[PDB]
């Protein structure tokens, strides 16, 4: 949150910011395919 | 750390013995002259050198096996033990080619717990079982029914009695000391006239507090008693075979290896137990100072004011627990930092029945095993072994080891001295601690070997070892000088 | 079965205090003087010992270590543990 | 800015390999692609068929007096006729009729899955425990009964494993560190936790290895002539290394970090950042995927969740760490040109060390540093710098 | 923090080949581990040791190499005659039971039978291939009582809750002289706390004013907790050793002439050391240390006013369980309690670890074998080890930040840091005021020598310790027989 205010005329302002990140990984398994004598 | 490590030294070699008539080898040895310590490099070399021979002196090594030769182990067994349905040779040899087998034990029968552990000789100086000397799997017929609780047991032929002898001690102490002090001193002075005035103040506090709590609780539980027979013993074959490999000539190195492999003394009477020692030791201190002063003058005017306030609090606490018999689930929960709830204590003692340590033990020198019914030229092997045993005690006794810091204890396993560190100090020499000082317990240097015959003397000193540096404990456990007849 | 159990405890505390006040004045130009002093000193000490020493002969190995585990709250013995020792 | 894939030309054709009936050359990657320019894929080795220019040698490669199994793998008659099926293709019924029973005379015993996966291959790309070069279903006709691990039940240990010692360890390492300052005010936090459980360690035998029928025959298939593509194809399908020993277990790790500040005319500012992560490996799904979540939140854990999670590692471990051995040490001598295969596996691994070098990619902007991924050099950065090259904020 | 010193790995140029030894059927050569990588830089494609097939200059020697008794032709072991047809498998070929009544296999091998038979590596702390034969019995039926056997079972058919007959006995391997089964534990605990505060003022006024104030508050906690438990202890034999068959053949395969490669390979495969004795245990250590501090000061005069506060908290916490079940060592890792200790202890019944042990350098094994003296080989094996403990040594693995362990993984070093990623600059959370020791730089090679002088040298570390950090056990020079 950010605020700026002044007088001489009256001036006021505000800013507000949010950021979120979440992830979750549930790994089951992994593989590699035979690069010779492959059956198609 | 204030160190420069000590690397091992063995001596320059002995001369060779002449060739042994019966072992057909010759031997050379060195004394251990300085042990490895502060992680200085080992030089162990297994403490010996040996060579083959070409001499032709007569030998009488054929002491007759009267019964049956155990083909692999070189044991002899009396003829009533062949085909008894039991392994009397070690390698099952005695039960070969049995035209019938006769059983004796009518029921299953446990070995008494640790009875094979008691079968091994001790190095009395490290206080350690080294290796196997009497065959606690030998039953000579036997099969007499023995009971503990409702469990039934088989007694090794070597053992006179294993019996519960079921005794227990608890000893407890708790101590508190406390002391308190508080002092307050003040001054005030004033003057005025109509113009001038003056004022002065001091207030003070000094304060102190101290406490100790000390608690010790020890239990000794003694729920078996072992006594070995005096003689007519049946040896473990691995011991018997190094004994048949000893020279009749004297050269200390081959005899030294028997004490390394099989211990210096055999265990003849022992009480078998659990111990549960607990100690909790606490020292606590607090202090304060407060001080406050003012001065004033008036005429125009001036003020001065000061405060100085201070506090300290500390605890040092140590706890040690040692437990020496039982089963690992109980043993860990007893070993926990909290004073054991009596259920734990119950289940621990119940398991001490099934796995004891030795509490107190009376031991005999191993040469009383060496016997004319078991070895050729036995009496020479005895006299040799007696001399070697005395020379070995001079090697294994800890006295060579340079003193530990922090009141650490040396035990000199193998050919290295390692300082066991108490609670509250750490590192190779036990130097590293937060604490200011520690009381030191005394031990001598190695004793001077002998003076001349016609009245003979041995002498000891404590020059580095002594208690007075940093206000230590007891200096002594025996005689600061020693003398005897030559014969 | 045997017990010895002994508890012994002591306290002292002390306070001492001393003071003075003095005053003088003159007039015809007015003028006065005052002096005041105070001291307080206090000392206190405590001590406690407990020793307790249950000893047992006969009993099952666990029941022995059960009964002989000293209770600060019951120095003679917990009645059920004691009865269990007396069984074992 | 973004950069596309770049490669060498295609090297000049090999001559025709007599027994393999093929011919190839290769193409080095120069740049994999960078900063989301067009990412590389295209082949480093590719090949054409040939009717060979000279005769192939005699095809048999039998180790002398050894028994020629249907695999074509070197074995001795004790391994077949004792019914154990060591030679790699379950042939024992062909070999003996009388008393061919397994080496455990009466006391037949279960295998172990934790033993079978011993000697995983490993590759510097992805660091994957590739399925075993070793044939841990060869037992050398041994009965070889362990009773180790927490199931309190006997198992036969495989020939290529010197021991699978279940030398248990459980360790938690924990640190926290916090600070405060004021004149304005500042507040700072760091937290680290890891927990490791080692169920056991396997060591692979350093002589007399039995390899899978596929591993040995898939080196028979090599070029014999130093051609990258076929050597790389053996690497990328069996490893750059094998795990010559390693530690089976489970692991968790956590972090929390916070960093916080606060500071006519009216001026003020506030600044804050947050970072939290959780990792879990090993154990069965229900307990692991409970706990990895559960520990990211503040929750004061039931010790029984730790007991259940780490108990399940007995049934489902992960490799925590291991001793890498360069893979070519598994071409058994008493095979035709065995050493020339070793030599050029090592030269192909040296060629592996040449092109996958990240160092030649271009500099990331601002406070960043470069990483390599499958077809991209890229970066990620402090101080709120943004984009795949960190050029902006 | 200091910049990294990452470098690509180097092996040496190759040595010339050894000649084609009969029976071995092999040429060998080596590279000298010239410089395995510092903590960063890409690994060597190559390796230290090589074998290649070759036909021999003469015909292979017969099993008369064993002398007057049997040898299993397809493997190493020379056997005493009684082992042929004893009813038990004495060699890897099994021919000692071919073409022909021990029941002692009724009892499982003693817990630790493996890890005590395996060699050991003082340069990496790893095990190695079997040195002793973990399963050799020599025909002995030597049983050992299990002092931990006691475990509960319940029987629904007869209403007994009672302790099971399982695990009561183990068969001892012939290579263990004794293995004892006595129950012990020992725990040592410290707590120390220190706590301090100071508060001070002064003021002057005249008719000017000045006022000053200072505050400090501090706390320390240390504790160490150590436990050891033992279920048994053991000592290996020092005469008539039966080697592992793998060791035995890998030894016979060594050259009578001194060439470094084959002896370095046997060192690397069978280990720098062999375990002479050990203890089988569970150790739990726990260590917990805390510092805190808080300070303030004020100053006022006329006027203007200023104030500041600074405060710290830091905690180091370790929990480590060796031995026990995977489950309960997770329990006792995560939490210290009367819960986690008791079940951990129950799991030490089943899964112990070797907690502490004593050892000898590998060449001493040979003299204690049934093979008779091998003095030429034994000296070559020593002569190679006397280079090896310089060449393969973790001393070369260089700077580790934040007290990290330097270890050589085969041909490549790691610095296992206790926080952060490995290698240089392991910290970014800790300040540059952090405390870490100085620890050894390596041995030199054996220096140039004179009739009464030869030297080998060390440095306590290359840099000074980080801030108030500790230092090495203290050496600069060691000496040799020239
Ligand atoms: C000097 O005078 C001050 C009087 O206030 C005494 O200080 C107090 O003493 C009483 C009685 O012991 C305590 O209950 C108060 O807490 C004290 N106040 C403080 C914080 O100073 C002090 O005793 C005097 N010194 C003497 C006795 O000479
Ligand atoms: C504070 O905020 C007010 C809001 O109107 C503004 O008028 C003033 O100029 C700012 N400065 C002050 C009052 O400190
Ligand atoms: C273990 O958990 C208990 C019960 O919640 C708690 O009292 C204790 O402080 C914990 N101990 C440790 C070491 O976390
Ligand atoms: C015996 O011991 C000395 C001391 O090292 C050596 O010079 C030599 O081995 C001698 O024979
Ligand atoms: C030297 O002599 C005696 C032998 O009676 C030793 O026991 C002791 O060490 C003394 O100093
Ligand atoms: C030869 O190599 C070029 C690369 O310069 C390819 O474009 C072409 O297809 C052929 O393989
Ligand atoms: C071993 O190393 C040399 C350099 O010493 C190379 O020419 C070649 O790799 C040889 O095999
Ligand atoms: C330095 O340290 C090792 C370990 O003791 C020695 O064996 C060797 O001399 C090395 O140079
Ligand atoms: C230095 O590193 C440690 C600390 O002394 C030791 O284990 C070793 O002696 C080495 O030289
Ligand atoms: Ca018999
Ligand atoms: Ca046999």
XYZ file of N, CA and C in Angstrom, chain D residues 76 78 103 105 124 140 142 144-150 152 154 157 159 162-163 165-183 190 192-199 201 203-207 241 244-245 252 257 295 301 303 306-314 321-324 326 328-329 333-334 339 342-343 345-350 353 359, chain E residues 6 8 14 17 25-26 29 31 41-47 49-53 74 92-93 97 105 108-109 114-115 118 126-130 151 167 244 246 249-250 253 265 268-270 306-331 333-335 339-340 350-353 409-410 414 418-420 428-431:
546
model
N 28.113 -70.420 -16.834
C 28.668 -71.756 -16.545
C 27.582 -72.711 -16.054
N 26.698 -74.845 -13.760
C 26.140 -74.759 -12.394
C 24.977 -73.759 -12.256
N 19.154 -73.058 -5.351
C 20.280 -73.253 -4.440
C 19.886 -73.273 -2.959
N 18.088 -75.172 -0.771
C 17.685 -76.588 -0.909
C 16.209 -76.837 -0.575
N 24.065 -37.211 -16.842
C 24.280 -35.805 -16.475
C 23.125 -34.910 -16.952
N 24.072 -65.713 -9.518
C 25.278 -66.532 -9.547
C 25.073 -67.923 -8.918
N 23.717 -68.522 -6.248
C 23.824 -68.374 -4.797
C 22.422 -68.364 -4.171
N 22.154 -66.821 -1.079
C 22.426 -65.429 -0.698
C 21.319 -64.697 0.094
N 20.883 -65.308 1.200
C 19.809 -64.828 2.079
C 20.257 -63.681 2.984
N 19.834 -62.465 2.682
C 19.645 -61.446 3.708
C 18.358 -61.723 4.520
N 18.217 -61.051 5.661
C 16.941 -60.837 6.342
C 16.736 -59.370 6.726
N 17.368 -58.458 5.989
C 17.463 -57.050 6.363
C 16.254 -56.214 5.891
N 16.218 -54.934 6.249
C 15.011 -54.111 6.143
C 13.979 -54.405 7.244
N 12.986 -53.526 7.391
C 12.120 -53.493 8.578
C 10.933 -54.471 8.519
N 11.081 -57.517 8.616
C 11.464 -58.619 9.506
C 11.234 -59.989 8.843
N 12.971 -62.681 5.445
C 14.120 -63.041 4.607
C 13.960 -62.643 3.129
N 19.517 -61.615 -1.990
C 20.232 -60.439 -2.508
C 20.868 -60.733 -3.867
N 23.298 -60.789 -7.348
C 24.731 -60.997 -7.536
C 25.527 -59.713 -7.651
N 27.046 -56.023 -3.627
C 27.994 -56.557 -2.658
C 27.335 -56.674 -1.281
N 26.636 -55.622 -0.862
C 25.572 -55.695 0.133
C 24.546 -54.595 -0.124
N 23.008 -52.942 2.680
C 22.987 -52.762 4.132
C 21.886 -51.775 4.489
N 20.876 -52.190 5.251
C 19.856 -51.272 5.758
C 20.381 -50.526 6.993
N 21.464 -49.776 6.823
C 22.102 -48.982 7.864
C 21.273 -47.727 8.148
N 20.240 -47.842 8.991
C 19.260 -46.764 9.143
C 19.831 -45.510 9.760
N 19.421 -44.371 9.225
C 19.622 -43.057 9.802
C 18.352 -42.247 9.637
N 17.980 -41.475 10.651
C 16.987 -40.407 10.562
C 17.594 -39.133 11.122
N 17.713 -38.068 10.344
C 18.265 -36.800 10.819
C 17.368 -35.633 10.436
N 17.083 -34.752 11.396
C 16.515 -33.425 11.184
C 17.587 -32.389 11.479
N 17.829 -31.519 10.526
C 18.671 -30.343 10.647
C 17.739 -29.135 10.589
N 17.848 -28.221 11.543
C 16.959 -27.070 11.646
C 17.751 -25.814 12.003
N 17.373 -24.687 11.421
C 17.961 -23.378 11.696
C 16.873 -22.325 11.593
N 16.913 -21.359 12.493
C 16.158 -20.113 12.385
C 17.028 -18.943 12.802
N 16.691 -17.773 12.286
C 17.489 -16.569 12.431
C 16.613 -15.354 12.119
N 16.595 -14.382 13.027
C 15.666 -13.261 12.995
C 16.324 -12.000 13.547
N 15.945 -10.839 13.025
C 16.518 -9.557 13.430
C 15.484 -8.452 13.409
N 15.700 -7.446 14.250
C 14.897 -6.228 14.292
C 15.789 -4.994 14.481
N 15.430 -3.895 13.829
C 16.131 -2.611 13.904
C 15.101 -1.475 13.924
N 15.321 -0.418 14.705
C 14.474 0.779 14.666
C 15.238 2.057 15.034
N 14.831 3.185 14.445
C 15.397 4.526 14.672
C 14.258 5.559 14.673
N 14.662 -15.719 8.515
C 15.035 -16.911 7.755
C 14.697 -18.194 8.528
N 15.042 -22.614 7.869
C 15.422 -23.797 7.104
C 15.153 -25.053 7.915
N 14.545 -26.042 7.275
C 14.333 -27.365 7.839
C 14.633 -28.402 6.780
N 15.411 -29.441 7.102
C 15.400 -30.682 6.320
C 15.363 -31.904 7.194
N 14.669 -32.930 6.732
C 14.631 -34.236 7.355
C 14.948 -35.313 6.339
N 15.849 -36.214 6.691
C 16.396 -37.239 5.813
C 16.244 -38.539 6.532
N 15.781 -39.546 5.819
C 15.776 -40.884 6.354
C 16.430 -41.770 5.318
N 17.468 -42.484 5.733
C 18.207 -43.420 4.908
C 17.781 -44.786 5.371
N 17.116 -45.521 4.504
C 16.693 -46.884 4.768
C 17.868 -47.848 4.617
N 21.949 -48.616 2.063
C 22.930 -48.355 1.007
C 23.248 -49.632 0.248
N 25.950 -51.267 -2.681
C 27.246 -51.183 -3.374
C 27.253 -52.203 -4.513
N 27.567 -51.788 -5.739
C 27.684 -52.658 -6.906
C 29.076 -53.284 -6.999
N 29.158 -54.567 -7.345
C 30.404 -55.344 -7.373
C 31.366 -54.802 -8.439
N 32.624 -54.514 -8.083
C 33.595 -53.835 -8.980
C 34.362 -54.748 -9.966
N 34.153 -56.066 -9.912
C 34.582 -57.060 -10.905
C 33.532 -58.158 -11.004
N 26.823 -42.637 -16.765
C 27.390 -43.303 -15.592
C 26.469 -44.405 -15.108
N 27.434 -46.795 -8.977
C 28.284 -47.884 -8.493
C 28.048 -48.206 -7.032
N 27.496 -47.263 -6.273
C 26.859 -47.443 -4.963
C 25.886 -46.298 -4.716
N 12.462 -34.753 3.230
C 11.650 -33.544 3.163
C 12.522 -32.312 3.399
N 10.743 -17.439 4.350
C 11.501 -16.188 4.454
C 10.544 -14.999 4.429
N 3.022 -29.760 6.219
C 4.184 -29.060 6.763
C 4.387 -27.652 6.189
N 2.671 -31.070 13.984
C 2.410 -32.357 13.344
C 2.165 -33.479 14.357
N 3.232 -36.888 15.395
C 4.409 -37.751 15.215
C 4.047 -39.028 14.451
N 4.725 -38.724 10.731
C 6.133 -39.018 10.465
C 6.425 -40.507 10.512
N 5.885 -41.219 11.489
C 6.054 -42.669 11.585
C 5.452 -43.369 10.374
N 4.220 -43.045 9.977
C 3.586 -43.651 8.808
C 4.312 -43.295 7.500
N 4.646 -42.018 7.260
C 5.404 -41.608 6.068
C 6.713 -42.370 5.952
N 7.570 -42.238 6.946
C 8.879 -42.816 6.867
C 8.867 -44.340 6.998
N 7.845 -44.949 7.599
C 7.656 -46.400 7.541
C 7.424 -46.856 6.106
N 6.617 -46.110 5.349
C 6.300 -46.431 3.953
C 7.506 -46.337 2.996
N 8.634 -45.728 3.398
C 9.887 -45.783 2.622
C 10.410 -47.223 2.501
N 10.104 -48.114 3.438
C 10.422 -49.540 3.339
C 9.831 -50.202 2.081
N 21.515 -39.991 -2.662
C 22.848 -39.740 -3.230
C 23.586 -41.048 -3.523
N 24.631 -40.981 -4.352
C 25.267 -42.138 -4.991
C 26.679 -41.834 -5.515
N 27.480 -42.873 -5.791
C 28.805 -42.803 -6.423
C 28.738 -43.091 -7.930
N 28.900 -42.059 -8.756
C 28.905 -42.165 -10.216
C 30.183 -42.839 -10.746
N 31.847 -43.845 -14.548
C 31.741 -43.753 -15.996
C 31.369 -45.085 -16.648
N 31.262 -46.955 -19.422
C 32.026 -47.864 -20.285
C 32.726 -48.983 -19.552
N 32.960 -48.845 -18.250
C 33.474 -49.906 -17.380
C 32.593 -51.164 -17.353
N 35.189 -57.504 -21.271
C 36.230 -58.111 -22.101
C 36.031 -59.620 -22.190
N 36.595 -60.233 -23.229
C 36.099 -61.468 -23.874
C 34.846 -61.210 -24.729
N 37.669 -53.204 -26.109
C 38.384 -51.992 -25.703
C 38.154 -50.806 -26.651
N 35.075 -49.168 -25.398
C 35.459 -48.327 -24.241
C 36.038 -46.993 -24.681
N 37.041 -47.029 -25.560
C 37.768 -45.843 -26.016
C 36.819 -44.794 -26.582
N 33.323 -44.730 -26.380
C 32.382 -44.259 -25.351
C 32.995 -43.089 -24.599
N 34.245 -43.209 -24.157
C 34.938 -42.103 -23.501
C 35.071 -40.892 -24.445
N 35.406 -41.080 -25.735
C 35.486 -39.932 -26.653
C 34.114 -39.314 -26.907
N 33.055 -40.113 -27.024
C 31.689 -39.605 -27.123
C 31.245 -38.856 -25.855
N 31.611 -39.322 -24.660
C 31.331 -38.583 -23.433
C 32.131 -37.274 -23.401
N 33.372 -37.247 -23.876
C 34.104 -35.987 -24.047
C 33.411 -35.029 -25.041
N 30.614 -33.433 -23.252
C 31.141 -32.346 -22.437
C 31.371 -31.079 -23.279
N 28.245 -22.093 -21.037
C 29.132 -20.916 -20.933
C 29.122 -19.997 -22.164
N 36.122 -22.622 -9.469
C 35.724 -23.731 -10.329
C 36.710 -23.982 -11.491
N 37.666 -27.278 -14.634
C 37.394 -28.583 -15.254
C 38.371 -29.646 -14.756
N 48.177 -41.198 -19.951
C 48.303 -42.609 -19.581
C 49.754 -43.019 -19.310
N 51.413 -49.752 -20.833
C 50.729 -50.979 -20.433
C 51.604 -51.944 -19.642
N 44.538 -62.837 -18.130
C 44.194 -62.601 -19.536
C 44.098 -61.113 -19.904
N 44.756 -60.239 -19.139
C 44.548 -58.796 -19.207
C 45.830 -57.998 -19.210
N 46.618 -50.472 -17.275
C 47.334 -49.199 -17.184
C 46.524 -48.244 -16.325
N 45.979 -43.781 -14.947
C 46.148 -42.325 -14.910
C 46.182 -41.921 -13.425
N 33.104 -26.870 -11.977
C 33.772 -27.278 -13.216
C 33.442 -28.719 -13.630
N 33.336 -28.954 -14.940
C 32.812 -30.205 -15.513
C 33.744 -31.394 -15.283
N 33.169 -32.585 -15.105
C 33.909 -33.792 -14.727
C 34.824 -34.353 -15.832
N 35.766 -35.221 -15.448
C 36.610 -35.972 -16.379
C 35.763 -37.015 -17.119
N 35.904 -37.124 -18.443
C 35.279 -38.242 -19.178
C 35.902 -39.584 -18.765
N 37.213 -39.572 -18.504
C 38.014 -40.734 -18.136
C 37.932 -41.172 -16.672
N 38.776 -42.144 -16.350
C 38.911 -42.826 -15.065
C 40.364 -43.268 -14.781
N 41.747 -46.286 -13.782
C 42.196 -47.657 -14.015
C 41.549 -48.292 -15.251
N 42.306 -49.109 -15.984
C 41.915 -49.722 -17.261
C 42.221 -51.230 -17.266
N 41.323 -52.060 -17.804
C 41.627 -53.435 -18.207
C 41.272 -53.689 -19.684
N 42.164 -54.384 -20.397
C 42.028 -54.762 -21.809
C 42.427 -56.230 -22.034
N 41.709 -56.973 -22.880
C 42.000 -58.394 -23.147
C 43.335 -58.600 -23.874
N 37.178 -72.594 -10.599
C 36.578 -71.413 -11.251
C 36.606 -70.128 -10.392
N 32.702 -69.652 -4.053
C 31.752 -69.112 -5.038
C 31.411 -70.104 -6.162
N 32.305 -71.041 -6.480
C 32.022 -72.097 -7.456
C 31.159 -73.231 -6.875
N 31.060 -78.789 -2.556
C 29.848 -79.582 -2.325
C 29.429 -80.361 -3.591
N 23.142 -73.258 9.716
C 22.374 -72.265 8.944
C 20.943 -72.039 9.475
N 20.251 -67.113 11.636
C 20.599 -66.075 10.673
C 21.938 -65.420 11.008
N 22.627 -64.803 10.047
C 23.901 -64.174 10.311
C 23.737 -62.990 11.242
N 27.611 -57.979 7.782
C 28.004 -57.311 6.554
C 28.926 -56.132 6.840
N 28.466 -55.081 7.520
C 29.192 -53.808 7.503
C 30.539 -53.873 8.218
N 32.902 -55.496 5.487
C 33.238 -54.550 4.442
C 34.428 -53.722 4.864
N 33.173 -43.899 3.328
C 32.344 -44.945 2.741
C 32.791 -46.353 3.126
N 31.904 -47.334 2.986
C 32.313 -48.736 2.890
C 32.993 -49.077 1.548
N 33.450 -50.322 1.405
C 34.061 -50.857 0.194
C 33.617 -52.305 -0.028
N 34.143 -53.002 -1.026
C 33.818 -54.416 -1.251
C 34.236 -55.256 -0.041
N 33.688 -56.461 0.118
C 33.989 -57.315 1.280
C 35.489 -57.593 1.421
N 10.593 -59.836 22.498
C 9.546 -59.123 21.745
C 8.173 -59.744 22.020
N 14.502 -64.948 16.662
C 15.797 -64.252 16.747
C 16.693 -64.634 17.946
N 37.329 -62.513 1.678
C 36.313 -62.578 0.630
C 36.911 -63.212 -0.628
N 36.146 -62.408 -3.644
C 36.399 -61.248 -4.467
C 37.698 -60.589 -4.077
N 40.838 -63.256 -5.118
C 41.199 -63.143 -6.529
C 41.740 -61.762 -6.859
N 41.118 -60.680 -6.401
C 41.599 -59.321 -6.670
C 42.979 -59.039 -6.098
N 45.593 -61.355 -8.403
C 45.706 -60.568 -9.631
C 46.705 -59.390 -9.540
N 44.012 -49.840 -7.424
C 42.683 -50.396 -7.708
C 42.183 -51.317 -6.608
N 41.214 -49.008 -3.756
C 39.936 -48.384 -4.078
C 38.736 -49.336 -3.997
N 38.889 -50.590 -4.391
C 37.822 -51.579 -4.382
C 37.652 -52.241 -3.025
N 38.726 -52.561 -2.308
C 38.643 -53.244 -1.008
C 38.786 -52.317 0.203
N 16.715 12.013 19.717
C 17.018 10.821 18.913
C 16.936 9.534 19.757
N 16.491 8.433 19.138
C 16.366 7.092 19.733
C 16.722 6.017 18.708
N 17.285 4.902 19.169
C 17.475 3.702 18.356
C 17.337 2.415 19.185
N 16.922 1.327 18.528
C 16.832 -0.039 19.066
C 17.419 -1.038 18.071
N 18.133 -2.053 18.558
C 18.590 -3.196 17.745
C 18.425 -4.508 18.506
N 17.979 -5.568 17.834
C 17.737 -6.872 18.447
C 18.009 -8.059 17.504
N 18.340 -9.206 18.096
C 18.773 -10.441 17.430
C 18.133 -11.671 18.073
N 17.814 -12.686 17.268
C 17.611 -14.055 17.730
C 18.170 -15.066 16.720
N 18.951 -16.051 17.171
C 19.496 -17.109 16.303
C 19.413 -18.457 16.990
N 18.955 -19.494 16.291
C 18.836 -20.851 16.824
C 19.461 -21.902 15.904
N 20.366 -22.713 16.447
C 20.911 -23.918 15.821
C 20.322 -25.155 16.482
N 19.698 -26.044 15.707
C 19.040 -27.242 16.224
C 19.388 -28.440 15.349
N 19.838 -29.516 15.977
C 20.215 -30.760 15.329
C 19.529 -31.889 16.056
N 18.969 -32.827 15.311
C 18.522 -34.096 15.845
C 19.006 -35.190 14.910
N 19.741 -36.192 15.401
C 20.270 -37.258 14.538
C 20.248 -38.607 15.194
N 19.582 -39.521 14.532
C 19.353 -40.887 14.933
C 20.152 -41.764 13.990
N 21.027 -42.595 14.527
C 21.703 -43.663 13.802
C 21.196 -44.967 14.386
N 20.764 -45.892 13.558
C 20.078 -47.106 13.980
C 18.602 -46.866 14.216
N 17.824 -47.934 14.226
C 16.371 -47.924 14.373
C 15.634 -48.174 13.053
N 14.304 -48.124 13.068
C 13.464 -48.274 11.865
C 13.391 -46.960 11.085
N 13.114 -47.016 9.781
C 12.909 -45.823 8.953
C 11.778 -44.956 9.519
N 10.650 -45.572 9.903
C 9.521 -44.892 10.555
C 9.917 -44.162 11.839
N 10.374 -44.897 12.850
C 10.670 -44.294 14.146
C 11.899 -43.405 14.169
N 12.883 -43.612 13.298
C 13.961 -42.633 13.129
C 13.451 -41.344 12.483
N 12.339 -41.375 11.752
C 11.604 -40.172 11.363
C 10.912 -39.509 12.551
N 10.280 -40.305 13.414
C 9.715 -39.820 14.677
C 10.759 -39.104 15.533
N 13.817 -38.142 14.677
C 14.347 -36.988 13.959
C 13.477 -35.758 14.222
N 12.163 -35.868 14.033
C 11.265 -34.719 14.082
C 11.064 -34.165 15.499
N 11.004 -35.033 16.516
C 10.634 -34.679 17.890
C 11.468 -35.424 18.957
N 7.877 -40.237 24.100
C 7.290 -40.986 22.996
C 8.392 -41.487 22.061
N 9.139 -40.580 21.444
C 10.000 -40.932 20.320
C 11.189 -41.797 20.721
N 15.721 -54.624 15.989
C 15.671 -55.160 14.632
C 16.691 -54.545 13.695
N 16.921 -53.236 13.772
C 17.824 -52.554 12.862
C 18.870 -51.725 13.606
N 19.958 -52.339 14.090
C 21.094 -51.628 14.651
C 22.031 -51.083 13.579
N 22.872 -50.131 13.956
C 24.006 -49.611 13.179
C 25.310 -49.879 13.931
N 33.693 -37.712 -3.973
C 33.009 -38.761 -4.745
C 33.954 -39.217 -5.862
N 33.896 -40.462 -6.332
C 34.899 -40.992 -7.272
C 35.218 -40.028 -8.427
N 32.831 -32.908 -3.684
C 31.667 -32.156 -3.172
C 32.043 -31.416 -1.886
N 25.858 -27.395 5.315
C 24.736 -27.648 6.265
C 23.510 -26.737 6.058
N 23.677 -25.712 5.220
C 22.664 -24.796 4.694
C 23.045 -24.379 3.262
N 22.044 -24.025 2.452
C 22.221 -23.535 1.080
C 22.780 -24.562 0.084
N 23.817 -16.800 2.166
C 23.209 -15.526 1.771
C 22.224 -15.025 2.851
N 21.870 -15.870 3.827
C 21.022 -15.545 4.976
C 21.875 -15.111 6.166
N 22.991 -15.806 6.405
C 23.982 -15.427 7.415
C 24.823 -14.225 6.966
N 25.182 -13.348 7.904
C 26.040 -12.177 7.643
C 27.510 -12.576 7.472
